[PDB]
Write a protein that binds this ligand. Structure first.
Ligand SMILES: *C(=O)/C=C/c1ccc(O)cc1
Length: 125
């Protein structure tokens, strides 16, 4: 697989070189969002955690359509503030519970190297 550790300091540089196939080799879930919250990339490990089919969620809005349980000041609110400010680096635990067994995860959101792109990284806890 692709050897990159969750929470690594330079993760956005390392992931800038990966196509969708290489992203599927990561040990943790990875979602790339645009500044409106639309899903641009969604890897295999994320689909294993959540049950979603990675090919079908691309193009959907994460906060409106896919993950309403994240539409809250504690998750979406942090994303919105990061987009508005142009910088974002925050890690926190959360529970995903929409149409699935409630699953506790650690989330790391970080601005990507590309201009209007943001990463959401997820692992089980
Ligand atoms: C709450 O509704 C969270 C649901 C969710 C989180 C992450 C995903 O990749 C998919 C659904």
């Amino acid at each position: 697989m692709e050897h990159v550790a969750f929470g690594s300091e330079d993760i956005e540089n390392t992931l800038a070189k990966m196509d969708d196939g290489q992203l599927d080799g990561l040990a943790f879930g990875a979602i790339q969002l645009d500044g409106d919250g639309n899903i641009l990339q969604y890897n295999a490990a994320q689909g294993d955690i959540t049950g979603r089919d990675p090919k079908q969620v691309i193009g959907k809005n994460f906060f409106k359509d896919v993950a309403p349980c994240t539409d809250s000041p504690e998750f979406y609110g942090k994303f919105k503030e990061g987009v508005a400010s142009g910088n974002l680096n925050t890690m926190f635990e959360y529970t995903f519970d929409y149409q699935m067994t409630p699953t506790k995860v650690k989330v790391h959101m970080k601005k990507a190297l590309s201009g209007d792109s943001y990463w959401v990284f997820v692992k089980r806890v």
